[PDB]
Design a protein around this ligand. Structure first.
Ligand SMILES: *CCC(=O)Nc1cc(N2CCN(C)CC2)ccc1Nc1ncc2c(n1)-n1ccc(C(=O)Nc3c(CC)cccc3CC)c1CC2
Length: 269
């Protein structure tokens, strides 16, 4: 029976549907009993650089409302020295929770989801944004269509140190090799991570998921003598897409515009 205020509008909280550190997403009702998702971000421990990164992300979310329907709808927000409340569309489910529950994926739904992701990421690239942290958790299914939730500009978030909280989070399964060699990030970096998502939607695992030692996994990702397996499948076009996305040299790696003109995305059945 809890509520919150956003720009002098009262929302009733139904349940928590997400959490990242102390940040939370609530399923809510407005006065007209219409459903929304409110994303809460805590600014209390944020320094000026972190605060600016959140402001920048909101600015882009706002601007790109016009430029694409492959980006989550933002209806309203309140920003104060203590917090950010964002009133967003309540989607069916995030892609990661969907992939967890699904035994196998329909070839036509995989193809459609792939095209949505490419279009969403191509949009942010056209505005000079490289996400650099793409995985299934960054995409929302809305009426059988995928939308990007965030742009990856903000790198920090207050940890969860109170709820009955996990330090063992943050996979490197989708991380591209050029990011590790620099330790050179470009739009090609997002192609690799998207490649890893499609590879999971095809074979039921990410390319290096079997390597449980994180140091061994990072070595394998940059090791050209570590051959990524592409088992034979009926969809030879899909096989080809995955080999093009998962080239270790970013200069040899396929671009998103080329991917959007590939037979896999363009030719159906
Ligand atoms: C509208 C009905 C509803 O609740 N939808 C829904 C349900 C679920 N489920 C329910 C079933 N369980 C088993 C799995 C989870 C998930 C998601 C949604 N819909 C929805 N709609 C809008 C948003 C979100 N979900 N959502 C979830 C997580 C985020 C988000 O912003 N995540 C991040 C956080 C958390 C604050 C921090 C940092 C980065 C990210 C991006 C991944 C959102 C956005 C809005």
């Amino acid at each position: 029976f809890q509520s919150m205020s956003v720009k002098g509008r009262i929302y009733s909280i139904l349940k928590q549907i997400g959490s990242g550190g102390s940040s939370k997403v609530f399923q809510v009702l407005n006065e007209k009993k219409q459903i929304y998702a409110i994303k809460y971000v805590n600014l209390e421990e944020a320094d000026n650089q972190t605060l600016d990164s959140y402001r920048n992300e909101i600015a882009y979310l706002n601007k790109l409302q016009q430029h694409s329907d492959k980006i989550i709808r933002l209806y309203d927000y309140e920003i104060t020295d203590q917090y950010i409340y964002m009133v967003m569309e309540c989607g069916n489910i995030d892609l990661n929770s969907w992939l967890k529950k699904k035994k196998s994926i329909d070839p036509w739904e995989r193809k459609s989801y792939w095209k949505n992701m490419l279009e969403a990421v191509h949009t942010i690239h056209q505005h000079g944004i490289v996400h650099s942290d793409l995985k299934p958790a960054n995409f929302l299914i809305v009426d059988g269509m995928l939308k990007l939730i965030d742009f990856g500009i903000a790198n920090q978030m207050q940890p969860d140190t109170t709820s009955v909280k996990d330090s063992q989070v943050g996979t490197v399964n989708y991380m591209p090799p050029e990011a590790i060699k620099d330790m050179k990030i470009s739009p090609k970096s997002d192609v690799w991570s998207l490649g890893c998502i499609l590879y999971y939607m095809t074979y039921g695992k990410t390319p290096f998921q079997q390597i449980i030692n994180q140091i061994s996994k990072l070595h394998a990702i940059i090791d050209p003598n570590h051959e990524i397996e592409f088992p034979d499948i009926p969809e030879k076009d899909l096989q080809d897409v995955l080999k093009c996305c998962l080239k270790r040299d970013p200069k040899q790696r396929i671009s998103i515009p080329e991917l959007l003109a590939h037979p896999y995305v363009q030719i159906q059945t």
